[PDB]
């Protein structure tokens, strides 16, 4: 009728493998394709102007977060994880990061405000 629980606890040793600890040849991908940051335009002079012209959606209230960025380089140095640390909500931070990388590609944050 089985009230007694399992007959054995199967456990395997941990025995470190000298072959898996062997040094790994590494490259940094910043060596293969070098990272860089685009300098501000007259269109987008500040990080705050940027967060203003990337604000389109009612639910992507980008302009409200201006204080959570200290300067220009701070913006383009952010990635999504470290962007979550700073307490920006979800779809908002995706809007932000998307905008940034888009500006990096040569597409400035010029888009019509859909709120109305």
């Amino acid at each position: 009728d089985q009230t007694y629980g399992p007959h054995k606890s199967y456990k395997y040793t941990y025995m470190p493998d000298p072959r898996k600890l062997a040094p790994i040849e590494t490259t940094q991908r910043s060596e293969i394709v070098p990272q860089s940051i685009r300098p501000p335009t007259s269109y987008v002079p500040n990080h705050e102007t940027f967060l203003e012209r990337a604000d389109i959606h009612r639910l992507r209230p980008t302009s409200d977060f201006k204080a959570s960025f200290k300067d220009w380089n701070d913006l383009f140095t952010c990635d999504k994880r470290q962007l979550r640390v700073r307490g920006i909500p979800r779809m908002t931070r995706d809007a932000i990061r998307t905008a940034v990388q888009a500006f990096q590609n040569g597409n400035p944050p010029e888009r019509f405000d859909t709120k109305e």
């Binding site: 040094p23 040849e25 910043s30 060596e31 070098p34 860089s36 380089n73």
Partner: protein, 238 residues
């Protein structure tokens, strides 16, 4: 929250995790005392370097751990300051003694991990001596100049343009790589000359130039001028 429970990622370098009650419990039953036989300071005949790598100020502050209390095999993770490259890190003495573990930067010190000293490349002091002055000055610049010019060491430099400090690779800075390793970006030398933030402007000069000349820009230009007896196979086209 919920997601707090997730185990972190354990990459290839790192051995056993000890994240579970089962994994914690048997080591919780080990209690160490420092006798004369365990004390690090007695063993300076061997481990002298390891002794001079310890942060004597910071460890007694944060960890409340005296330097006379530290075993040669000590499992506690204490603060270190690298006596080569001068960077701070936190590890256990046991791991530096049993195998060599130390500052993560000096792992990549040699040009390739697979073969440690096998480089035939000259040092930085020789091949590109003009780099030694751009190193951010911690006082260890004479040790960093000693490295291979092909070295993958991650070093910090003071940018010429804005005078600030950024972090790049020695070989990325020189451009030279060892035969049989992976080629870097052809432009890497020009691109790592400055900050990641200061780099754009100078390297956008020749492009504006080439669209000034011909009124048209294609990245093709370099490869074209590479063009101005090659063995080739018989073909089945006929």
């Amino acid at each position: 929250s919920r997601w707090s429970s997730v185990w972190p990622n354990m990459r290839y370098g790192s051995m056993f995790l000890s994240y579970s009650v089962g994994r914690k419990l048997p080591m919780k039953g080990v209690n160490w005392v420092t006798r004369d036989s365990n004390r690090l300071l007695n063993f300076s005949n061997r481990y002298s370097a390891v002794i001079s790598d310890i942060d004597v100020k910071r460890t007694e502050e944060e960890l409340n751990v005296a330097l006379s209390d530290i075993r040669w095999n000590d499992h506690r993770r204490i603060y270190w300051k690298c006596s080569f490259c001068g960077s701070s890190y936190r590890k256990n003495v046991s791991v530096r003694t049993k195998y060599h573990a130390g500052c993560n930067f000096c792992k990549k010190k040699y040009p390739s991990e697979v073969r440690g000293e096998q480089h035939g490349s000259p040092p930085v002091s020789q091949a590109a001596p003009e780099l030694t002055e751009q190193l951010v000055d911690n006082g260890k610049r004479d040790n960093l100049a000693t490295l291979a010019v092909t070295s993958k060491f991650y070093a910090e430099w003071t940018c010429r343009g804005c005078g600030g400090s950024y972090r790049s690779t020695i070989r990325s800075r020189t451009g030279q790589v060892e035969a049989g390793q992976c080629t870097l970006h052809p432009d890497i030398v020009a691109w790592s000359a400055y900050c990641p933030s200061c780099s754009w402007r100078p390297n956008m000069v020749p492009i504006a130039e080439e669209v000034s000349r011909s009124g048209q820009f294609l990245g093709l230009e370099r490869s074209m001028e590479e063009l101005g007896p090659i063995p080739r196979r018989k073909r089945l086209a006929c």
